[PDB]
Amino acid sequence: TIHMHAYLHKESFKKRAPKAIKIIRFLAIKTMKTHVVKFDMGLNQFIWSQ
RNA sequence: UGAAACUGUCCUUAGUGCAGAUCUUGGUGGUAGUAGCAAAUACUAAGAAGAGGAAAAAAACAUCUUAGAACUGAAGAGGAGA
């Protein structure tokens, strides 16, 4: 579970959802050690729901 | 180095000697990898094509399809004419 409010606190509004995708990609890199990270379609849609 | 013309002496002739003219024409520096590439709300994900996203995150990736999110808001960023 990613406490995204810690990363997107006081962030520019037009760069919240795009920066959410960047943060997740960094956590997958620091964990699975793989640079090739592919997002599911559902995960992208949830991030942009709001 | 260069590959087909040239030189010395005496007279004669002159469009005859350049550092300057904000000189003319052309070429080139420091400035300097500097000032900048900041109006028009905004893009993200998967796939295809392509030499062209690689990687010790090189954090960004043009085009097309689908999905999400959006803008012009109908005296329009629509459809048509002089």
**What is the rounded end-to-end Cα distance, in angstroms, of chain A?**
19
Q: What was the elucidation method?
A: cryo-EM
* CA distance readout (Å), A49 to A7, A35, A36: 18, 26, 25
Q: Say if CB A11 and CB A19 are below 8 A apart.
A: yes
Strand B neighbors by CB, 7 A: A 14, 17-18, 21-22, 25-26, 29, 33, 35-41, 44-45, 47-49
Resolution in A: 3.0
- Please answer whether residues A20 and A2 qualify as being in contact, where contact means their C-beta atoms are separated by less than 8 angstroms: no
Q: Nearest nucleotide, C1' to the C-alpha of A30?
A: B57
Q: Report helix, strand or coil for A20.
A: helix
- CA A1 to mean position of chain CA atoms: 12
Are A17 and A47 within 8 A, CB to CB? yes
Task: Evaluate whether A49 touches A17 at the Cβ level (below 8 Å).
Answer: no
**Around Cβ A16, how many Cβ atoms within 10 Å?**
14
Strands (DSSP E) found in A1-50: none
A20: number of Cβ within 10 Å: 19
Q: For residue A22, give both structure tokens.
A: 């960047």
Interatomic CA–C1' length for residue A15 and nucleotide B71, angstroms: 17
Neighbours of A44 (CB within 10 A): 13
